RNA sequence: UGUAGGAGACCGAUAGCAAACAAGUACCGUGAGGGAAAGAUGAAAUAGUACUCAGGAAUGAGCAAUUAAAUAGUACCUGAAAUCGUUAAGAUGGAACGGAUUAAGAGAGAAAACAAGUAAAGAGGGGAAUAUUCUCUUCUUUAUUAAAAGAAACAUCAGUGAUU
RNA sequence: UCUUAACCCACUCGUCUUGAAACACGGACCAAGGAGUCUAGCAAAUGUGCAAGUGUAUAUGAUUCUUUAAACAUUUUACGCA
RNA sequence: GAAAAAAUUUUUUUUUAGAAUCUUUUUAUGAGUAGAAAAUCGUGGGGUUUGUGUUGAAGCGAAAUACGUGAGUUUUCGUGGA
């Protein structure tokens, strides 16, 4: 540490490089979820699949 | 840009006009210029100036 | 070694995004700008088409 | 409202297809737009400034006199057209025509 | 990014801005925060004083939602009310506005600022400051303790 | 274009071009049909067969008509009777012609060809 | 030494070829500025290969001018004639490296119509 | 401020429409460039060794 | 050889010209530079310089603060080389004449509602090129949170700069040198 | 990870997987193991060097010969530098090169580094008048008057010296 | 332009070192390859958009479906930070 | 907003600037390792613009009355064939 710099709070001392994950599937995953529920509803005659709480 | 009259009229609705609840962008307000009129040379030309 | 850790994307902000679209549409409006952009405007018969 | 010829120069003084600048010695920056009178890059040269701009060009094997909406025409004929719609400048357009007219 | 970097300014320059005499090597006082109090005491004292030691009792599971505190000052209390509605209250001497601060998201009303003189208002809240209470009484308003 | 089932890469198309099964080899050994024949059969192009009569439209050998001798599927080259060439030692062989460069006049009729024509029309 | 031609004065003819380039064969003759200590260039000992210096820079009226008395403009398309006619009295055409002979000949003819010589006119003939 | 609408045959000219208020917005060319570049970064694929 | 202090050079500091590529602001500073050089008065020159300045030297001015100043100048035109912000601690307006660099829409609407006047700098230039009977205003410089950390070293006697603290936590940065009980105190 | 798709602001054969290939191979290690180098003629070889002569043969040459092309012949695309060969020119009394400044040689060049217009007869091109009459133009060609431009030289000034 | 000449001047470059022409260290030669980067968090700077708010998070939605792996939208007290 | 020359007052020849990180003008200044800044020039790819291609480009060797203080840029001949 030097000059006006705040003390750090990082935890990258453990071997994080094989414990890290980056999401590149997001929008396609969202599309897949939409497709899955749409297919399910349609299969059920188009009848509601929704749950009343 | 080549517009349909349909498109041109819809555009006007979208960014505020008629206040259409689903077509309008939710409580959106268009930006305004810092300079009211960019003809600076007309300001220079003016009698007061 | 290159890794997928790389900050490829960016958050582009909603108000900024809207402003860019609106301002680009306004710019598209301007006849002088259309020609400057390289569109062959000579035989066109209105400022927005 | 939000626009002027002055603002257009601010937008376009580096940015325009018709702007060409010499690499081979850095003295020489041209603006070649259809309504541009003298093909140096200045707004007073530029076809994007004057309200009903007037220019002698050549295109498609033919000397064309153009006026800004946007009208186009092909010595007596030239002389007559310049006197008619037109508003230093006349003298330059005559000089330009003399040079253009010989060309094949 | 790459084309504007300091390395692009210094590309053929040996040590290249990091000291030819120095001959640049990593963390040469030791790692991270570690030289604090020992070797970097002067930096830590001058820039982060109250860092070292043990102060106070402990509260083993804090549970911050239990003691949650969304405040407003009296100054901004009127600001929760629209302009035209406020004009109607200003006009009509016979009535006062009720303001449910909790329904607008707040629990405590504090005493910074001014309430306009001779102008009753009803303030509903869980908590009020002594000063806030005094101002509400002073202006002829009412305070409502409410859950 | 629109289908995402098949690659738009140069790479896959080339590999497919080189590793072709026989029906594919036959497809890319098709030639364009003569104009009245196209009207007759309702068919733009046909797979070449042994006793076909082609006209050459490209290369130094253009404008020559003639019967097909042998077809070379492997090098994708047809041989025609009057496109001879002598070699370094003076042996005469036929010049191999890619099927892009020929237009088909009289196709050979046979049972398989009849089935193809019936399928097409 | 100094090379006057009319009111076009150019200060230095000889290019500032790089320090001891023949001495170490790996070195190329184009200038490279020593970051070396005791280099006999920056440490400014007389009698070595001279450093280039901004002081040698051209006069503002000349700046990029040729003994031709016209600024060179490089030409790869016919269409480049249209600004060059108005500037012909101050600018000269040079035809680009690529230019196909049929097009090149046509440009040469055009240059004559514009009344401006091509400085590399004999090329590709 | 009215702009003329044309038919699909450009010989013929139909009902004139008022220009939208979107086209009156400021032209922020630097904003448009910076947003475009930021957007382009979002469209670029990741890479690693 | 001539002996020279600072090698004979005037090497004064600050902005050369507007660094932004924003067309409207570049156009606006050209106008105000033109006015500044021709006009006798200081006013235009000061406005031109202030228009050029950095973002942190473009603070917002409070509507309440402008209102508080203008009540001694009751018919006069305020010009503000920054943005004007609205106030939700403010009960009502007293009707104002304001030229500003930027208006928040709620403030502008409030000014219009009040029957006041919203002036752009081009409109001001047209109406008042001299600046006679006009009033130059500017917002707080040292209000900003970076400046709240500037000045004398944390824990050094009489200091009152905010530290660049590690985190919000109770146990942190209240001990050594910040209370007499632990080591010492500032 | 296995298999199948689809990709790219990725690499372009010293890179990219160790592997664009008959490479997890050759090869090395007692063994566990360690582990390479290694792509491209041409459109077409169903164009891959026929023939002749001199040679023991290899090879070589050809009046002979494929190809658009063979200092393109399968150790085949392009073919840099280092390196070494041939011819010519120069230099050469214990270095070698350099800087600054001239010189003599050896090369190169006409684009500013001379000659507008005028007349004659060849080659082209255009515009107007109501497809072809009128008319405007640029290059070659014969010779025929200008001129300008720089370098010299002296004089004349103005600035700056030195001299008596 | 190249080429020798000739007068005058001209010490191995890099390098660490207060100090190298050195009896200091590295360099036979040539070609290709060959070294301040990327992520996280933070800071100041400057630009930009908005302002007592701000960001739209996960996600939902669509007459969104080669390029679309983005773009667009979000039926008034969610959360971060202020 | 008209200056000159050539002809035979009128014909012919040249020129005729307004682009703010801009143009005109003036004066002062010009050392430099470690170091900081700015202006440049080049390489790979991307979008964009408007071009160059087998009446041989790139590439490569040798050059150029070439241009740039400079890195470099531009170009000629030879090879070369996408």
PDB file of C-alpha atoms in Angstrom, chain I residues 6-180:
ATOM      1  CA  UNK I   6      11.717  30.489 -16.177  1.00  0.00           C
ATOM      2  CA  UNK I   7      13.703  30.594 -19.481  1.00  0.00           C
ATOM      3  CA  UNK I   8      11.912  33.859 -20.419  1.00  0.00           C
ATOM      4  CA  UNK I   9       8.608  32.017 -20.706  1.00  0.00           C
ATOM      5  CA  UNK I  10       5.144  32.842 -19.469  1.00  0.00           C
ATOM      6  CA  UNK I  11       3.893  29.332 -18.601  1.00  0.00           C
ATOM      7  CA  UNK I  12       0.466  30.138 -17.126  1.00  0.00           C
ATOM      8  CA  UNK I  13      -2.093  27.352 -16.769  1.00  0.00           C
ATOM      9  CA  UNK I  14      -5.725  26.203 -17.243  1.00  0.00           C
ATOM     10  CA  UNK I  15      -8.003  25.339 -20.163  1.00  0.00           C
ATOM     11  CA  UNK I  16      -6.800  26.214 -23.699  1.00  0.00           C
ATOM     12  CA  UNK I  17     -10.156  25.585 -25.403  1.00  0.00           C
ATOM     13  CA  UNK I  18     -13.214  23.343 -24.972  1.00  0.00           C
ATOM     14  CA  UNK I  19     -12.129  19.680 -24.942  1.00  0.00           C
ATOM     15  CA  UNK I  20     -15.667  18.366 -25.645  1.00  0.00           C
ATOM     16  CA  UNK I  21     -16.684  17.422 -29.193  1.00  0.00           C
ATOM     17  CA  UNK I  22     -20.281  18.544 -28.412  1.00  0.00           C
ATOM     18  CA  UNK I  23     -21.363  20.756 -31.408  1.00  0.00           C
ATOM     19  CA  UNK I  24     -23.818  23.009 -29.525  1.00  0.00           C
ATOM     20  CA  UNK I  25     -21.357  23.882 -26.770  1.00  0.00           C
ATOM     21  CA  UNK I  26     -18.522  24.451 -29.284  1.00  0.00           C
ATOM     22  CA  UNK I  27     -20.837  26.758 -31.221  1.00  0.00           C
ATOM     23  CA  UNK I  28     -21.889  28.514 -27.997  1.00  0.00           C
ATOM     24  CA  UNK I  29     -18.310  29.196 -26.878  1.00  0.00           C
ATOM     25  CA  UNK I  30     -17.444  30.595 -30.333  1.00  0.00           C
ATOM     26  CA  UNK I  31     -20.323  33.081 -29.832  1.00  0.00           C
ATOM     27  CA  UNK I  32     -19.328  34.062 -26.320  1.00  0.00           C
ATOM     28  CA  UNK I  33     -15.633  34.348 -27.309  1.00  0.00           C
ATOM     29  CA  UNK I  34     -16.674  36.705 -30.145  1.00  0.00           C
ATOM     30  CA  UNK I  35     -18.741  38.813 -27.738  1.00  0.00           C
ATOM     31  CA  UNK I  36     -15.978  38.771 -25.111  1.00  0.00           C
ATOM     32  CA  UNK I  37     -13.219  40.000 -27.447  1.00  0.00           C
ATOM     33  CA  UNK I  38     -15.286  42.788 -29.064  1.00  0.00           C
ATOM     34  CA  UNK I  39     -17.295  44.029 -26.018  1.00  0.00           C
ATOM     35  CA  UNK I  40     -15.632  46.443 -23.522  1.00  0.00           C
ATOM     36  CA  UNK I  41     -17.136  44.789 -20.393  1.00  0.00           C
ATOM     37  CA  UNK I  42     -15.641  42.076 -18.143  1.00  0.00           C
ATOM     38  CA  UNK I  43     -18.997  40.235 -17.979  1.00  0.00           C
ATOM     39  CA  UNK I  44     -18.878  38.491 -21.366  1.00  0.00           C
ATOM     40  CA  UNK I  45     -15.232  37.396 -20.886  1.00  0.00           C
ATOM     41  CA  UNK I  46     -15.978  35.908 -17.477  1.00  0.00           C
ATOM     42  CA  UNK I  47     -18.991  34.049 -18.941  1.00  0.00           C
ATOM     43  CA  UNK I  48     -16.872  32.723 -21.847  1.00  0.00           C
ATOM     44  CA  UNK I  49     -14.152  31.424 -19.471  1.00  0.00           C
ATOM     45  CA  UNK I  50     -16.743  29.903 -17.143  1.00  0.00           C
ATOM     46  CA  UNK I  51     -18.443  28.158 -20.110  1.00  0.00           C
ATOM     47  CA  UNK I  52     -15.067  26.546 -21.030  1.00  0.00           C
ATOM     48  CA  UNK I  53     -14.451  25.090 -17.483  1.00  0.00           C
ATOM     49  CA  UNK I  54     -14.437  21.369 -16.359  1.00  0.00           C
ATOM     50  CA  UNK I  55     -17.470  19.425 -15.063  1.00  0.00           C
ATOM     51  CA  UNK I  56     -16.519  19.855 -11.389  1.00  0.00           C
ATOM     52  CA  UNK I  57     -16.322  23.589 -12.149  1.00  0.00           C
ATOM     53  CA  UNK I  58     -19.780  23.218 -13.713  1.00  0.00           C
ATOM     54  CA  UNK I  59     -21.674  22.621 -10.361  1.00  0.00           C
ATOM     55  CA  UNK I  60     -25.473  22.872 -10.129  1.00  0.00           C
ATOM     56  CA  UNK I  61     -26.971  26.061  -8.670  1.00  0.00           C
ATOM     57  CA  UNK I  62     -29.986  25.645  -6.370  1.00  0.00           C
ATOM     58  CA  UNK I  63     -33.255  27.332  -7.374  1.00  0.00           C
ATOM     59  CA  UNK I  64     -33.753  28.337  -3.706  1.00  0.00           C
ATOM     60  CA  UNK I  65     -30.257  29.902  -3.615  1.00  0.00           C
ATOM     61  CA  UNK I  66     -30.930  31.828  -6.847  1.00  0.00           C
ATOM     62  CA  UNK I  67     -34.293  32.915  -5.444  1.00  0.00           C
ATOM     63  CA  UNK I  68     -32.656  33.973  -2.166  1.00  0.00           C
ATOM     64  CA  UNK I  69     -30.144  36.129  -4.084  1.00  0.00           C
ATOM     65  CA  UNK I  70     -32.592  37.682  -6.562  1.00  0.00           C
ATOM     66  CA  UNK I  71     -35.016  39.079  -3.940  1.00  0.00           C
ATOM     67  CA  UNK I  72     -32.652  42.063  -3.538  1.00  0.00           C
ATOM     68  CA  UNK I  73     -32.598  42.437  -7.344  1.00  0.00           C
ATOM     69  CA  UNK I  74     -36.262  42.121  -7.916  1.00  0.00           C
ATOM     70  CA  UNK I  75     -36.819  42.901 -11.621  1.00  0.00           C
ATOM     71  CA  UNK I  76     -33.400  41.801 -12.859  1.00  0.00           C
ATOM     72  CA  UNK I  77     -32.113  38.905 -15.022  1.00  0.00           C
ATOM     73  CA  UNK I  78     -29.991  36.191 -13.394  1.00  0.00           C
ATOM     74  CA  UNK I  79     -27.466  34.366 -15.575  1.00  0.00           C
ATOM     75  CA  UNK I  80     -25.982  31.084 -14.303  1.00  0.00           C
ATOM     76  CA  UNK I  81     -22.956  29.410 -15.939  1.00  0.00           C
ATOM     77  CA  UNK I  82     -24.175  26.000 -14.618  1.00  0.00           C
ATOM     78  CA  UNK I  83     -27.300  23.869 -14.215  1.00  0.00           C
ATOM     79  CA  UNK I  84     -30.319  24.916 -12.103  1.00  0.00           C
ATOM     80  CA  UNK I  85     -31.819  22.221  -9.871  1.00  0.00           C
ATOM     81  CA  UNK I  86     -35.218  22.066  -8.197  1.00  0.00           C
ATOM     82  CA  UNK I  87     -35.913  21.939  -4.468  1.00  0.00           C
ATOM     83  CA  UNK I  88     -38.264  19.637  -2.583  1.00  0.00           C
ATOM     84  CA  UNK I  89     -37.469  21.555   0.615  1.00  0.00           C
ATOM     85  CA  UNK I  90     -38.929  24.609  -1.157  1.00  0.00           C
ATOM     86  CA  UNK I  91     -42.633  25.414  -0.623  1.00  0.00           C
ATOM     87  CA  UNK I  92     -43.235  27.761  -3.609  1.00  0.00           C
ATOM     88  CA  UNK I  93     -41.608  30.260  -6.037  1.00  0.00           C
ATOM     89  CA  UNK I  94     -41.618  34.090  -6.050  1.00  0.00           C
ATOM     90  CA  UNK I  95     -41.280  34.418  -9.892  1.00  0.00           C
ATOM     91  CA  UNK I  96     -37.820  34.652 -11.477  1.00  0.00           C
ATOM     92  CA  UNK I  97     -35.864  35.522 -14.632  1.00  0.00           C
ATOM     93  CA  UNK I  98     -33.182  32.873 -15.154  1.00  0.00           C
ATOM     94  CA  UNK I  99     -30.603  32.082 -17.829  1.00  0.00           C
ATOM     95  CA  UNK I 100     -28.800  28.785 -17.174  1.00  0.00           C
ATOM     96  CA  UNK I 101     -26.561  26.220 -18.927  1.00  0.00           C
ATOM     97  CA  UNK I 102     -29.029  23.401 -18.203  1.00  0.00           C
ATOM     98  CA  UNK I 103     -32.511  23.283 -16.651  1.00  0.00           C
ATOM     99  CA  UNK I 104     -33.991  20.238 -14.883  1.00  0.00           C
ATOM    100  CA  UNK I 105     -37.445  19.753 -16.383  1.00  0.00           C
ATOM    101  CA  UNK I 106     -39.260  19.936 -13.002  1.00  0.00           C
ATOM    102  CA  UNK I 107     -37.515  23.275 -12.210  1.00  0.00           C
ATOM    103  CA  UNK I 108     -38.251  24.658 -15.684  1.00  0.00           C
ATOM    104  CA  UNK I 109     -41.917  23.669 -15.338  1.00  0.00           C
ATOM    105  CA  UNK I 110     -41.996  25.264 -11.869  1.00  0.00           C
ATOM    106  CA  UNK I 111     -40.465  28.485 -13.299  1.00  0.00           C
ATOM    107  CA  UNK I 112     -43.035  28.492 -16.141  1.00  0.00           C
ATOM    108  CA  UNK I 113     -45.860  27.796 -13.641  1.00  0.00           C
ATOM    109  CA  UNK I 114     -44.557  30.677 -11.477  1.00  0.00           C
ATOM    110  CA  UNK I 115     -44.736  32.924 -14.607  1.00  0.00           C
ATOM    111  CA  UNK I 116     -40.948  33.237 -14.670  1.00  0.00           C
ATOM    112  CA  UNK I 117     -38.598  33.171 -17.644  1.00  0.00           C
ATOM    113  CA  UNK I 118     -36.301  30.378 -18.919  1.00  0.00           C
ATOM    114  CA  UNK I 119     -33.459  31.843 -20.982  1.00  0.00           C
ATOM    115  CA  UNK I 120     -30.864  29.992 -23.030  1.00  0.00           C
ATOM    116  CA  UNK I 121     -27.456  31.687 -23.384  1.00  0.00           C
ATOM    117  CA  UNK I 122     -28.043  32.438 -27.103  1.00  0.00           C
ATOM    118  CA  UNK I 123     -31.365  34.115 -26.179  1.00  0.00           C
ATOM    119  CA  UNK I 124     -29.567  36.030 -23.406  1.00  0.00           C
ATOM    120  CA  UNK I 125     -26.839  37.067 -25.894  1.00  0.00           C
ATOM    121  CA  UNK I 126     -29.480  38.427 -28.271  1.00  0.00           C
ATOM    122  CA  UNK I 127     -31.422  40.269 -25.557  1.00  0.00           C
ATOM    123  CA  UNK I 128     -28.529  41.520 -23.402  1.00  0.00           C
ATOM    124  CA  UNK I 129     -25.228  41.538 -25.380  1.00  0.00           C
ATOM    125  CA  UNK I 130     -23.777  44.202 -23.039  1.00  0.00           C
ATOM    126  CA  UNK I 131     -24.819  42.441 -19.818  1.00  0.00           C
ATOM    127  CA  UNK I 132     -26.182  45.764 -18.478  1.00  0.00           C
ATOM    128  CA  UNK I 133     -28.721  45.246 -15.657  1.00  0.00           C
ATOM    129  CA  UNK I 134     -27.848  41.500 -15.591  1.00  0.00           C
ATOM    130  CA  UNK I 135     -26.580  39.416 -12.661  1.00  0.00           C
ATOM    131  CA  UNK I 136     -23.844  36.796 -12.858  1.00  0.00           C
ATOM    132  CA  UNK I 137     -24.401  33.745 -10.598  1.00  0.00           C
ATOM    133  CA  UNK I 138     -22.527  30.506  -9.920  1.00  0.00           C
ATOM    134  CA  UNK I 139     -23.008  27.474  -7.607  1.00  0.00           C
ATOM    135  CA  UNK I 140     -20.864  26.086  -4.746  1.00  0.00           C
ATOM    136  CA  UNK I 141     -17.295  24.979  -5.676  1.00  0.00           C
ATOM    137  CA  UNK I 142     -16.316  23.125  -2.486  1.00  0.00           C
ATOM    138  CA  UNK I 143     -19.640  21.309  -1.940  1.00  0.00           C
ATOM    139  CA  UNK I 144     -18.382  18.191  -3.785  1.00  0.00           C
ATOM    140  CA  UNK I 145     -17.484  14.980  -1.882  1.00  0.00           C
ATOM    141  CA  UNK I 146     -13.915  14.668  -3.273  1.00  0.00           C
ATOM    142  CA  UNK I 147     -13.066  18.060  -1.699  1.00  0.00           C
ATOM    143  CA  UNK I 148     -14.559  16.742   1.580  1.00  0.00           C
ATOM    144  CA  UNK I 149     -11.558  14.340   1.581  1.00  0.00           C
ATOM    145  CA  UNK I 150      -9.035  17.039   0.598  1.00  0.00           C
ATOM    146  CA  UNK I 151      -6.851  18.998   3.076  1.00  0.00           C
ATOM    147  CA  UNK I 152      -4.694  17.977   6.077  1.00  0.00           C
ATOM    148  CA  UNK I 153      -3.761  14.289   6.611  1.00  0.00           C
ATOM    149  CA  UNK I 154      -6.266  12.125   8.616  1.00  0.00           C
ATOM    150  CA  UNK I 155      -5.147  11.767  12.256  1.00  0.00           C
ATOM    151  CA  UNK I 156      -2.702  14.697  12.048  1.00  0.00           C
ATOM    152  CA  UNK I 157      -3.480  17.543  14.621  1.00  0.00           C
ATOM    153  CA  UNK I 158      -6.394  19.950  13.910  1.00  0.00           C
ATOM    154  CA  UNK I 159      -7.286  17.970  10.718  1.00  0.00           C
ATOM    155  CA  UNK I 160     -10.895  17.478   9.676  1.00  0.00           C
ATOM    156  CA  UNK I 161     -10.669  15.890   6.190  1.00  0.00           C
ATOM    157  CA  UNK I 162     -12.851  12.777   5.618  1.00  0.00           C
ATOM    158  CA  UNK I 163     -10.736   9.580   5.274  1.00  0.00           C
ATOM    159  CA  UNK I 164     -11.027   7.348   2.209  1.00  0.00           C
ATOM    160  CA  UNK I 165     -12.512   4.696   4.541  1.00  0.00           C
ATOM    161  CA  UNK I 166     -12.263   0.942   3.952  1.00  0.00           C
ATOM    162  CA  UNK I 167     -15.981   0.277   4.505  1.00  0.00           C
ATOM    163  CA  UNK I 168     -18.964   1.451   6.595  1.00  0.00           C
ATOM    164  CA  UNK I 169     -18.278  -1.038   9.489  1.00  0.00           C
ATOM    165  CA  UNK I 170     -18.537  -0.165  13.196  1.00  0.00           C
ATOM    166  CA  UNK I 171     -15.222  -1.674  14.293  1.00  0.00           C
ATOM    167  CA  UNK I 172     -13.169   0.079  11.619  1.00  0.00           C
ATOM    168  CA  UNK I 173     -11.226   3.368  11.653  1.00  0.00           C
ATOM    169  CA  UNK I 174     -12.289   4.720  15.080  1.00  0.00           C
ATOM    170  CA  UNK I 175      -9.410   3.334  17.212  1.00  0.00           C
ATOM    171  CA  UNK I 176      -5.649   4.254  17.033  1.00  0.00           C
ATOM    172  CA  UNK I 177      -5.148   8.054  16.965  1.00  0.00           C
ATOM    173  CA  UNK I 178      -8.873   8.721  16.626  1.00  0.00           C
ATOM    174  CA  UNK I 179      -9.691   8.098  20.296  1.00  0.00           C
ATOM    175  CA  UNK I 180      -7.431   8.939  23.283  1.00  0.00           C
TER     176      UNK I 180
END
